[PDB]
Amino acid sequence: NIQGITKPAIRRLARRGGVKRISGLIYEETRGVLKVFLENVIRDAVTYTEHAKRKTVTAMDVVYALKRQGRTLYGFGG
Amino acid sequence: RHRKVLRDNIQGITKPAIRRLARRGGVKRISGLIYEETRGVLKVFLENVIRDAVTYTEHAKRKTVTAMDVVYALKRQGRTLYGFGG
Amino acid sequence: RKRSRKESYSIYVYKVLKQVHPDTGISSKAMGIMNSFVNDIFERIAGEASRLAHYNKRSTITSREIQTAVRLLLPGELAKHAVSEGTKAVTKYTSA
Amino acid sequence: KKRKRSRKESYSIYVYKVLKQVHPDTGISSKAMGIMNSFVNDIFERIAGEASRLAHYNKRSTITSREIQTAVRLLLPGELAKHAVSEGTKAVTKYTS
Amino acid sequence: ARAKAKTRSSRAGLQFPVGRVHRLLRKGNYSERVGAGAPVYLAAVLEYLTAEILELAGNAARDNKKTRIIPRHLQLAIRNDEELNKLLGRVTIAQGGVLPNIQAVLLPK
Amino acid sequence: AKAKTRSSRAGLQFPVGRVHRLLRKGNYSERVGAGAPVYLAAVLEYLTAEILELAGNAARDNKKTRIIPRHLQLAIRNDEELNKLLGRVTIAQGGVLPNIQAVLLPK
Amino acid sequence: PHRYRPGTVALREIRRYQKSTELLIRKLPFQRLVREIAQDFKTDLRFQSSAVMALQEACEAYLVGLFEDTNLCAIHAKRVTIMPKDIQLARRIRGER
Amino acid sequence: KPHRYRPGTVALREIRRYQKSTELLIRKLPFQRLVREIAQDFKTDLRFQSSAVMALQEACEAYLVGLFEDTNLCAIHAKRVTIMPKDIQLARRIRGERA
DNA sequence: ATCAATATCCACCTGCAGATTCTACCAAAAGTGTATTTGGAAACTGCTCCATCAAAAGGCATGTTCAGCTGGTTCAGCTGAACATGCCTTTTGATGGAGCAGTTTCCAAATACACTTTGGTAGAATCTGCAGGTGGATATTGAT
DNA sequence: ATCAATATCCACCTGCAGATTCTACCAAAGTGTATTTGGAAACTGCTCCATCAAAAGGCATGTTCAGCTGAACCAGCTGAACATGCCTTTTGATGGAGCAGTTTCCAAATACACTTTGGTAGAATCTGCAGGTGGATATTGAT
Ligand SMILES: [Cl-]
Ligand SMILES: [Cl-]
Ligand SMILES: [Cl-]
Ligand SMILES: [Cl-]
Ligand SMILES: [Mn+2]
Ligand SMILES: [Mn+2]
Ligand SMILES: [Mn+2]
Ligand SMILES: [Mn+2]
Ligand SMILES: [Mn+2]
Ligand SMILES: [Mn+2]
Ligand SMILES: [Mn+2]
Ligand SMILES: [Mn+2]
Ligand SMILES: [Mn+2]
Ligand SMILES: [Mn+2]
Ligand SMILES: [Mn+2]
Ligand SMILES: [Mn+2]
Ligand SMILES: [Mn+2]
Ligand SMILES: [Mn+2]
Ligand SMILES: [Mn+2]
């Protein structure tokens, strides 16, 4: 499914990041990095979910997990 | 009494000391403009830590900065230091 | 049955928005950002105040711990103006 | 004329006991021991804090061995989390009986 | 017979809720006791920072000709203010975007 | 009955009563369960054991019978997970790991 | 026929996306990815829609910031083209790898 | 002859030697004077436990060494082996110390 | 630098659907009044350990030579930007129902206090690595 | 391809500063008893979540070539290496500043009972926004 994060999507992200020219190897590198990030956040969000004895991951689980990773997010309940 | 006025002490951090720090850091060659940058950077670092340590000292209504004040300051600056208490 | 009763700072943020910009309103998502903001600074200050009291072997958080916590947490001018507003509020409260 | 002194606690004795278990021949300098005391206090406060936040998020006023376990999963990497959960679960089941 | 109830916030000259903040302080396990002036001081500081951010963000919202502040304006205001940027340096505003910025070397000519 | 320490009941070297007291007096929650200090004591003992294991090894590699902070450093930094756990921590008098970027070596 | 010189449309794109705030990854691929990853941690999970939205906000903001840093590293090596080695330098300095 | 090492040989020798040891690399007294000057600019008539000064010096030197490793990586990135102020600045900017 | 010639962007309108503000109930909560308790400020003052000074002990500052590192220059291979089109994935929008979440209920398990040992700590009294000094062996570097 | 000239390496000693062991108080842990209570556990509403099928609409694909990167070459010059001259830091006592140990009495905290406001949810507004246009601004190529 990681291939679902397409070259144009990654290209737009890079453009918002101010990047003008992009080597072709960037897209796979970027996919790896995004996957590591998601694994890190999701592992904690899910830990929070199991702790609350739920089967549904809630927004707060993600927000708390993000806050632990030093990636605090405003606007989803915390 | 009181001691003599401390001025310009950042300059007591000599070129050879900065060079040794860079050597532990794995640095082989060093531009001549490095020594002033490093001094600058060092002073920012110290200003930042000492400010918090002194705030803790003042809060405790003490006149002496203790090792714990420094350790708490470091811990909040995200620079946790092991080996000095707490 | 009834859903829960949720508290938030929305009404107070709104009051402040009206004081500062009587003409201007605010989107609900913006209001969510501002809520998250108040809760976050809240928890940071209170946490710093908590540690301050524990280091000093004290069980009460007073406006002094809050003040020291503000000095530790806010950059520069923001710290100065917050300490000023805080002392001002406490004084007005005390006399009144 | 009347005299004064006080008492400070630390983990030294327990660290030393563990050191003798894993390395019967080996000792440790006082500075190293200071490093180890800092370590125990540091991990302590991290786990307890994570457990505090956890209990607060879930509207619970008691911190149980479950909160501790989750906090340990949140804070420790991988295999350390696995082995720590083992040692902890083991200690608790042993204690309970 | 009791007198007419006056909120603590009104006694303090504040818009933010002193009573709530005190409750939250007591129930967050920060300490055994909470002094009477502490929630007044903290509520005042929260109000101040909220005001600062709303000041700058309102400027942002109407300079681009809106009467409603949206998250974009909060981002523009926080990031264009060095001290707010510092205070919220490790925070992401959802739907905030970034500041317009192209490295000079990337420009033509 | 004859007093049995909680550490002994749980089979731990770390002090369970002490850990309990520190939990109760640290304001982490209104109440602390009877099982929380046992679990936490055990986890602390475990991480201590892991780190003293690796540092005892570093120490005997340096032909020393006594662990010094340098050995603690070497043990933390040569170990991916301890390095990660203590990634934002400084070991006083620990130094750094021998490492010279290849490009700096003579031709 | 008309043709923009390579780089012109790129700069135009930078301006366009730095001016906007909409999420830049398509929703569904992203969600399918989130669910795969999660199911490697815990099974038969469901997700609130806001939960997925928050994960995507976080991911995009992170990736945008990482691209800014990466681009600074490229500019540093006197190029205007970012490469895997740039992303890695940024990540190693950030203390991520 | 008289003997002379080529530029870089003693430098590499020094790297091996200082990466092998753990001693503080700044002299004690200058560092103390700096600490007291800065502190005195925040609050007057402060005293220091010597542990406090040592703790600041351990923290500072560890910070500076780590920053020099990152700086060196930025030099190597730009195909140089000489660290320059621009390298320190790139390192601090990515670290989010400056922005 | 100019002109054309395009191509894309961006104000400027418009009407109205949806998001915000507005209204009016109503439990929960903040406030009030009175009664007690109590954490910690203030006052003394013992006893660590800090500031201070000057004789030791030992690097730093300084200038000169030149190796080799950096940065400028040139240039072609080839990589990555631009672009045009239809297929395939994403989006959109109803549904049934899974499972959060709302309510309520009792017991295992929490706190609190008294009473009594007992493990932990603080020196005191030993014990013993290893720091620091040396010297000889081996390794490495740079000039012929 | 060899030698010097240095540097590092690597045991070996020996004494004492620092680590371990030893005892003896007491500060806290454990036991016992009595009292409150937090939060599973169980029983259902009702939110929204997963699914699915027919919309749109963005991306995958393949080709042309602009210009970016990386290589190769070279000179200017900067920073390393080193020998010299002596000033600065380290080291060791020691009075006394000021932490830290104690005691105690209030200003300031909690405890408990009783009685306006923030949240909520339709109604009533109003403002962006979606959509469309054309003028504004920008880029490209030929003189
Ligand atoms: Cl107060
Ligand atoms: Cl428990
Ligand atoms: Cl690469
Ligand atoms: Cl530079
Ligand atoms: Mn000064
Ligand atoms: Mn009484
Ligand atoms: Mn008392
Ligand atoms: Mn040359
Ligand atoms: Mn060509
Ligand atoms: Mn059901
Ligand atoms: Mn005993
Ligand atoms: Mn030796
Ligand atoms: Mn109950
Ligand atoms: Mn004395
Ligand atoms: Mn005195
Ligand atoms: Mn009462
Ligand atoms: Mn109201
Ligand atoms: Mn529009
Ligand atoms: Mn038309």
Author numbering:
A (entry chain B): 25 to 102
B (entry chain F): 17 to 102
C (entry chain H): 29 to 124
D (entry chain D): 27 to 123
E (entry chain G): 10 to 118
F (entry chain C): 12 to 118
G (entry chain A): 38 to 134
H (entry chain E): 37 to 135
Provide passages from the article that reported this PDB entry.
In eukaryotes, genomic DNA exists as chromatin, in which the histone octamer, composed of histones H2A, H2B, H3, and H4, wraps about 150 base pairs of DNA into a nucleosome. In cells, more than 10,000 DNA apurinic/apyrimidinic (AP) sites are generated in genomic DNA each day, by spontaneous depurination/depyrimidination and the base-excision repair (BER) process. To this end, an AP endonuclease (APE) specifically incises the 5′ phosphodiester bond of the AP site1112, and removes the AP site in coordination with the BER pathway. To elucidate the structure of the nucleosomal AP site, we reconstituted nucleosomes containing an AP-site analog, tetrahydrofuran (THF).
To reveal the AP DNA structure in the nucleosome, we crystallized the double AP nucleosome (with a 145 base-pair DNA), and determined its crystal structure at 2.5 Å resolution. Surprisingly, we found that the DNA structures of the two AP sites (AP site 1 and AP site 2) are totally different. As expected, in AP site 1, the base pairing at the THF site had disappeared, and the free orphan base was accommodated within the double helix, as in B-form DNA. In contrast, in AP site 2, the THF moiety was flipped out from the double helix, and the orphan base formed a base pair with the neighboring adenine base. Importantly, the 5′-edge adenine base of the complementary A-A-A-A tract lost its base-pairing partner, and was disordered. As a result, the inchworm configuration, which contains two flipped out sites on each strand without an empty space and a free orphan base, is formed. Although the base pairing had slipped by one base within the 5′-T-(T)-T-T-3′ stretch around the AP site 2 (inchworm), the structures of the base pairs are also similar to that of B-form DNA. This base-pairing slippage shortened the nucleosomal DNA from 145 to 144 base pairs. In the crystal with the nucleosome containing the 145 base-pair DNA, AP site 1 is located in close proximity to the neighboring nucleosome molecule, but AP site 2 is completely exposed to the solvent. These differences imply that the B-form like configuration may be induced by the crystal packing force. However, in our crystal structure, the inchworm configuration found in AP site 2 lacked an available free orphan base for APE1 binding.
